[PDB]
Design a binder for this molecule. Sequence first.
Ligand SMILES: CCCCCCCCCCCCCCCCCC(=O)OC[C@H](COP(=O)(O)O)OC(=O)CCCCCCCCCCCCCCCCC
Ligand SMILES: CCCCCCCCCCCCCCCCCC(=O)OC[C@H](COP(=O)(O)O)OC(=O)CCCCCCCCCCCCCCCCC
Ligand SMILES: CCCCCCCCCCCCCCCCCC(=O)OC[C@H](COP(=O)(O)O)OC(=O)CCCCCCCCCCCCCCCCC
Ligand SMILES: CCCCCCCCCCCCCCCCCC(=O)OC[C@H](COP(=O)(O)O)OC(=O)CCCCCCCCCCCCCCCCC
Ligand SMILES: CCCCCCCCCCCCCCCCCC(=O)OC[C@H](COP(=O)(O)O)OC(=O)CCCCCCCCCCCCCCCCC
Ligand SMILES: CCCCCCCCCCCCCCCCCC(=O)OC[C@H](COP(=O)(O)O)OC(=O)CCCCCCCCCCCCCCCCC
Ligand SMILES: CCCCCCCCCCCCCCCCCC(=O)OC[C@H](COP(=O)(O)O)OC(=O)CCCCCCCCCCCCCCCCC
Ligand SMILES: CCCCCCCCCCCCCCCCCC(=O)OC[C@H](COP(=O)(O)O)OC(=O)CCCCCCCCCCCCCCCCC
Ligand code: NA
Ligand code: NA
Ligand code: NA
Ligand code: NA
Lengths: 485, 485
Amino acid sequence: GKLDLEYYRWPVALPKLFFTKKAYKIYFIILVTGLLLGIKTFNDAAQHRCMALVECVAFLWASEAIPLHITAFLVPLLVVLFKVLKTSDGAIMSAASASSEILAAMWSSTIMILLAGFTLGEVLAQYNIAKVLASWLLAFAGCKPRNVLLMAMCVVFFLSMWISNVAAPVLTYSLLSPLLDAMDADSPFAQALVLGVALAANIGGMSSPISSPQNIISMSYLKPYGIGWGQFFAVALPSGILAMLLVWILLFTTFKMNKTKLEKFKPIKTKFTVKQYYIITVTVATILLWCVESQIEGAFGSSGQIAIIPIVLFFGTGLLSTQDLNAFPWSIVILAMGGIALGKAVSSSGLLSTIAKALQKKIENDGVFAILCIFGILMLVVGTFVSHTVSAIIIIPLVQEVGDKLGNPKAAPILVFGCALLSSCGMGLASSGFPNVTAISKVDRKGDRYLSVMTFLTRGVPASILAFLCVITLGYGIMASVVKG
Amino acid sequence: GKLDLEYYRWPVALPKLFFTKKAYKIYFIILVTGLLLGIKTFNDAAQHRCMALVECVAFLWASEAIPLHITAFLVPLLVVLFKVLKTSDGAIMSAASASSEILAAMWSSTIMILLAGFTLGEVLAQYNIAKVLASWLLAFAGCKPRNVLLMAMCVVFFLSMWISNVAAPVLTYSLLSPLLDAMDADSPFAQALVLGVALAANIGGMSSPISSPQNIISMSYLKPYGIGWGQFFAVALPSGILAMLLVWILLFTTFKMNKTKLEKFKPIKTKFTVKQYYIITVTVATILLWCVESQIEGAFGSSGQIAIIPIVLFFGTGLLSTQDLNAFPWSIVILAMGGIALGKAVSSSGLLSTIAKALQKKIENDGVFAILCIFGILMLVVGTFVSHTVSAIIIIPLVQEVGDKLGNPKAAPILVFGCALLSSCGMGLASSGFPNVTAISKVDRKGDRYLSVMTFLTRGVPASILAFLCVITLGYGIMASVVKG
Ligand SMILES: CCCCCCCCCCCCCCCCCC(=O)OC[C@H](COP(=O)(O)O)OC(=O)CCCCCCCCCCCCCCCCC
Ligand SMILES: CCCCCCCCCCCCCCCCCC(=O)OC[C@H](COP(=O)(O)O)OC(=O)CCCCCCCCCCCCCCCCC
Ligand SMILES: CCCCCCCCCCCCCCCCCC(=O)OC[C@H](COP(=O)(O)O)OC(=O)CCCCCCCCCCCCCCCCC
Ligand SMILES: CCCCCCCCCCCCCCCCCC(=O)OC[C@H](COP(=O)(O)O)OC(=O)CCCCCCCCCCCCCCCCC
Ligand SMILES: CCCCCCCCCCCCCCCCCC(=O)OC[C@H](COP(=O)(O)O)OC(=O)CCCCCCCCCCCCCCCCC
Ligand SMILES: CCCCCCCCCCCCCCCCCC(=O)OC[C@H](COP(=O)(O)O)OC(=O)CCCCCCCCCCCCCCCCC
Ligand SMILES: CCCCCCCCCCCCCCCCCC(=O)OC[C@H](COP(=O)(O)O)OC(=O)CCCCCCCCCCCCCCCCC
Ligand SMILES: CCCCCCCCCCCCCCCCCC(=O)OC[C@H](COP(=O)(O)O)OC(=O)CCCCCCCCCCCCCCCCC
Ligand code: NA
Ligand code: NA
Ligand code: NA
Ligand code: NA
């Protein structure tokens, strides 16, 4: 509310907001975006402008020159200013059509799932269910910080296996509240816990055939090859478990959390009440409906429609108030919507399809292992900046054609399965993916964020190579026998 | 956070939440919805189910059995459960397609405009611009509460004339903060001010050719008849002014606001600073870009894209924090999204078109005045429950065909103009329309809402008849000469 500004005076009078590090970052970003737009890169004008748009948004997010959710607000404006969206015929949309098309894509089923996760976390924490459940988990984990970390990653991984990683990190953070609440933002162990839940949700989003949209989509292509739930699990669960264990070792090695004193946790043995039993029943029913979504999709259509049921049943019954809904992390929602809009712009432009078909023209005729590693590297570099769902939708159909032409009869299922698993390894950027967006916005009791974008870059990029070597070594070894062709 | 419930005991043990008035309202609503679904009403099954859906949502909103923003969350779920959405060929959408199509309609351009209005109000109130401007307006208004009311309605009406009533009520409430802040929720004058700003924004949404989407759409049809900006103003501005004056008389007559003591307001004559000048410049530029949106639509596409500019320029420069964005009235946003979803369901099912074509087959061959009054009554009963934009989009094309077949050569322009003006008169329900949704959510310093849905029904329904008699008497009299044919 201060109405005063600082000036550099005669050195005739320019304010000091034009000479800060944020101003320098913005100058550099504008410079690079203008250079990309001016210099001819892609033959297609929409793809040429979408390359500049992707670079601009990615640099703005990585440098964090402005708040991450504000770049998310800025994405739709640039999608209309940079005429990147195209119609089905392939012509550039008019600005009005592009605006209506880009504002529609932000609100989606996963926004509903995230809001339901917020509702469930608040209702479990407010009525002492999460506190009771966190006394049995923390009793099993013990008094070693690395073991509590392992328990938290295992819990979020198992949750993401069945209900996906849109809402699993929120629920795990809600169960972690009895421990995270009394931890300052500069505590190494608290940072390790938040980052570990984020990374383990990212890894768990690739294990079960229903753990992510890119897994259901991949199974749609994989089914004709005879791959079922058991074959998918035998390959994707060991890979995810090994990747999660390696990331856990990285986390308790790179963080100075091992020398910490943890409160001894004796499990709470109180009896739940009728209100608490109602909350537990609604939570369990919502989780179960999220697990069997494909068998009730003819009525509900999506998990975002199922996500409404807890919201209505907890807010409509007075268990949660209007102030509780206004206290939701809406910056997380805005950041997620911005990520979705950027992915939709990339898909509509055709930018990623051209990159993927240019890669396809070179690495083809190569062996199945090499086409797997090169494409996995591609979706590891694209997936950390673009949504994994969009990247999988574009690439999984192409690797199928690449493998359908090879002499190996097991080549196509192996490539589709591998690219499905490797489509979730990009986790280095804190402003891409629901688990990452949730963890970057977590704040302590005083309001300071536990994690910066730099910590996410320094750990989640090594945690992306770790989750990528576990798929092309263990996962490929399991596919070599499991996949029959 | 209380884990205990009350029971009726042996009268063997049923809790007391099943015998409250809210439970009775819900029982009645389920009863009526099931009776509507069971009894055959409309030949089209989707329209027959949409009638029950509209009745259910309207009754839930009017009775306030559950919070209004929670019925807004419930609307998309019922749009999928009640299979009311249809494809372009007229076949019922699959639940997945219906879910993806109904969640895409919640986030729109007007949501962005409302968020920008929140941003502008917070940035003007936080940096003392609004308190400076409210010292010159309240000096002109004087020390009579009815005159302050007149000034507030005039300000919001003039704002809605140029930038529409999506953000004008928010800006007017921000300007009224120096007066509304120190007023408790049970004060008659505060309730009169909030309701008056709501009602005057509703009336102002019909005056200028760019005051509402149903005015731009109507001008699109009116242009071939020779009607221009001057002809539109000569008819719509006197009608709006008279309706606003009659509503102001209703407000200072039905509220015990006339016996009140108001603080003497001396104009604040301080000089703005560079930061305040930057805020003023950005606000004025955003308003001006909203006024000339049709001349810059080839670049921006919508006013919701223009609405992003203040958000980025105020949040990205640090003038507003993340906590300021989390303190936004998000229940208003959810309620608006629910209204939009209900309107889209009504449009897709074809329910409103069938009612409007059933009316058209009866009232046709009558005089131009009678077809005007009957259709205006229809859009006054539909517009208070369904969005005015959807109702206008459905009906304005039909009254054109009704008038194009009459013997009067001025019949079609008169009917299109009248139905454009009468499409904004429905203002009786507090959960329909941006000005109404904004006013029903306003809270005092202690958190108590100024207005209930009952107050909105008791004053805005007589304020809807008042705004409807002003169009068919003054407006029609002006059209009788202004319209040439
Ligand atoms: C309104 C005040 C600021 C509001 C908030 C600030 C951020 C949003 C507004 C500014 C964004 C850039 C608008 C101007 C360029 C749009 C692109 C365009 O016209 O089409 C491409 C443009 C024209 O394509 P057209 O759409 O076919 O006309 O490409 C070209 O062929 C010409 C490019 C020449 C170089 C122009 C210099 C632009 C530098 C990059 C600026 C990006 C900054 C993003 C924000 C970062 C900091 C926050
Ligand atoms: C002055 C510019 C340099 C400034 C320094 C920083 C700029 C950051 C670089 C970001 C990418 C922009 C440069 C790439 C342009 C290549 C276009 C080209 O040669 O096309 C010819 C060539 C022919 O045009 P066509 O007829 O459209 O096929 O295009 C291709 O076939 C594709 C070439 C490969 C393009 C790779 C682009 C990057 C992929 C990853 C995207 C997602 C990550 C975004 C963040 C980047 C950082 C990791
Ligand atoms: C206690 C906590 C709250 C949670 C409780 C919710 C439990 C109920 C949800 C599961 C029921 C769904 C079973 C039907 C799904 C299969 C559809 C199918 O096979 O499609 C064929 C069929 C058409 O064939 P298709 O086009 O090939 O799918 O699909 C339909 O037409 C869908 C049938 C609509 C059924 C209406 C009821 C939906 C569930 C009620 C909504 C929630 C209110 C619950 C109130 C209490 C009731 C217990
Ligand atoms: C076959 C005959 C069916 C009869 C009609 C259906 C009856 C069951 C559904 C409607 C229940 C309405 C009465 C209870 C809710 C009103 C009170 C309230 O919300 O506050 C409670 C109350 C606060 O209000 P207070 O006690 O009045 O202060 O909150 C609680 O104590 C916790 C809530 C406990 C359970 C309430 C909801 C139970 C129903 C959920 C099951 C599925 C509902 C499906 C709805 C559509 C059905 C087609
Ligand atoms: C899951 C637990 C509760 C969650 C939150 C509570 C509110 C949402 C869930 C309940 C909403 C109603 C679901 C069951 C009926 C759906 C309609 C349907 O199946 O299609 C029409 C249904 C079937 O059409 P179909 O879609 O072609 O199968 O219409 C008919 O022809 C049969 C109608 C017979 C009467 C059924 C009784 C329903 C009573 C109305 C309930 C509405 C209550 C709304 C909530 C108010 C309180 C909050
Ligand atoms: C047991 C039911 C009574 C329970 C008591 C409370 C019910 C509240 C009434 C809400 C409306 C539902 C009843 C109307 C059904 C008429 C259908 C009919 O006769 O069609 C035959 C008839 C022939 O079917 P067709 O082949 O589809 O044309 O339909 C028509 O031509 C249209 C008939 C006029 C329908 C008027 C419906 C109401 C218009 C306003 C909608 C927006 C406001 C929503 C809130 C209402 C309160 C103001
Ligand atoms: C200080 C507070 C901030 C506000 C300042 C913003 C002021 C600038 C906005 C107004 C400029 C728009 C003029 C062009 C609109 C007419 C388009 C037309 O005739 O369509 C034909 C033409 C195509 O014909 P059509 O398909 O029939 O429309 O439309 C276009 O291609 C659109 C041209 C794109 C121009 C790129 C620049 C857009 C404005 C820059 C975005 C904001 C960043 C400002 C940075 C500082 C620069 C001052
Ligand atoms: C032709 C050559 C063009 C050169 C490149 C364009 C330069 C102008 C646009 C970029 C300005 C970047 C430096 C200033 C902003 C960083 C500091 C900040 O946000 O905090 C300020 C500062 C807080 O940060 P602190 O002072 O560092 O603590 O807040 C203020 O004092 C109020 C903000 C005053 C005005 C700042 C924004 C002015 C630019 C708006 C005009 C349109 C922008 C269009 C962007 C895209 C262009 C293509
Ligand atoms: Na995956
Ligand atoms: Na990422
Ligand atoms: Na109107
Ligand atoms: Na209304």
